[PDB]
Amino acid sequence: KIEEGKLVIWINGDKGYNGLAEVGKKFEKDTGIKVTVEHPDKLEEKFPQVAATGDGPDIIFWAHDRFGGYAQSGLLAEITPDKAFQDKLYPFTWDAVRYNGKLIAYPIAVEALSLIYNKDLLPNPPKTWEEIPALDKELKAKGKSALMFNLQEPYFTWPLIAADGGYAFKKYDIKDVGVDNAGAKAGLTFLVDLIKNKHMNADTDYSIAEAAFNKGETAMTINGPWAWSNIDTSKVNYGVTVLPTFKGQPSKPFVGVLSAGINAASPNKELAKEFLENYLLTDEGLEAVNKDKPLGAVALKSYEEELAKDPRIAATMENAQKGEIMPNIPQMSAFWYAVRTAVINAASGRQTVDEALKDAQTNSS
Amino acid sequence: TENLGRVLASFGDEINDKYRQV
């Protein structure tokens, strides 16, 4: 609960919330301001509910794509860094958190999905989606599978859907939605055919795909930098590389910018700015979080330089450059909800690819 | 807050001006 003189922070359970707490510890030691970091489920769905009533956390972490909706609801405070601090973060990251001429959050790091593969099981990762079925048939004969990744969240399937022409919007035209065009159908259909041919299972979720890969049961998974920590712990000899192409076109993952917004109803708004600018968004601050769960390519120029040498980050950048930064408009939540239903229904066989995407085209308005 | 710090800096200038031997 938000009392005066304390910071409550929400951040999703797959990020490094423990490392963020030790940044909060350093903050309390200097300021006497206790920091409590929580990782509740459906954090992004609860925040608009409890913030609307003037409750919730002081600080909310999430990909930038959700903050436009929060902003137009009046749930986020305008953030007003001075030029000296604004110069410390890349301008394109600031762009991701600008809404109707407002900075509405602090950018933290750039996130892009990459192909993660087991070198012991698969020395040369496949360059194309098309060659995975044949690869799975060789691996199944030896008791393994080629690929498992989260099929319950459309984030992990959008790269294939967009590969051949799928897009969300279009400055941003909400009527022009590219969810049921020929490129989207061709991508989702390839996914469905993979399931029909028993190369994947519709019910695979994040935890199943992670356990399967980190236990050496599958040769490839699709995930972001936050997941590398557990792979290290599992000792799997892994690599991170460009996503597979589809119909000669690169996979186009939707690029997220982990951002920290300040609750407009919080009485601790200035305290949140001190913590975020002067403890989190420093080299030492981001390192603490990164050492718990890798952040990707951070928005801080000084620390991004230090990590760019990492080949895993470089592979992340390649996939990022071949992708597209997510819009932050409020309509993004409806788009996601719509596309989540279409992937699950098509994968499980409750709808065909066509009627699944048409409903999503409509629900995306 | 803004003008409180500016008024304090003028107070500090008055003191620096006094002890200035230069």
């Binding site: 005066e4 003189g5 200097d30 300021t31 006497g32 301001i33 009485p267 601790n268 200035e270 305290l271 700015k273 001190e274 | 807050t1 803004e2 409180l4 710090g5 500016r6 008024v7 304090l8 800096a9 107070f11 500090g12 200038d13 008055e14 003191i15 620096n16 001006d17 002890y19």
Partner: protein
């Protein structure tokens, strides 16, 4: 390290103020400090000169800030930044310490702020000097220069 060096001076300055007002704070029970006290003596002297020439400002300083547990530290940082935004001189260092001392002795012991804020503010003052002022201070000869400048 260096922050500790500044806290020693700030602690004694705030401790004497606390005892004049009559308070008995834990950690500030007395002055066992004994050549370093010469810094303390100069700071109390010139600090007292500055507030005795602007009494009504310091008498009503807390009433204008209306400090709460939410705004105490941000208000401190903002006011301190504004003291030195257009430059530094020994007189402004003093102004900053008299602001801090009164901030810890008076505004920090208001009903809605407990005794625990005395040591917090002393730490805020110390950290600020070590982070933002230490370069200029050692440029001007450190505390030895502070002493020579004010006699």
């Amino acid at each position: 390290a260096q922050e500790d060096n500044y806290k020693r001076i700030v602690k004694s300055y705030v401790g004497e103020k606390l005892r004049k007002k009559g308070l008995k704070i834990r950690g500030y029970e007395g002055e066992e400090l004994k050549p370093v006290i010469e810094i303390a003596k100069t700071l109390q002297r010139v600090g007292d000169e500055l507030e005795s020439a602007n009494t009504d400002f310091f008498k009503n300083m807390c009433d204008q800030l209306q400090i709460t547990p939410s705004t105490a530290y941000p208000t401190f940082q903002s006011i301190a930044d504004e003291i030195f935004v257009s430059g530094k001189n020994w007189g402004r260092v003093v102004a900053f310490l008299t602001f801090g001392g009164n901030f810890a002795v008076h505004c920090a012991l208001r009903a809605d702020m407990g005794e625990e804020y005395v040591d917090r503010v002393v730490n805020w003052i110390s950290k600020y000097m070590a982070v933002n002022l230490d370069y200029w201070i050692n440029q001007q000869g450190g505390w030895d220069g502070f002493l020579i400048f004010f006699e």
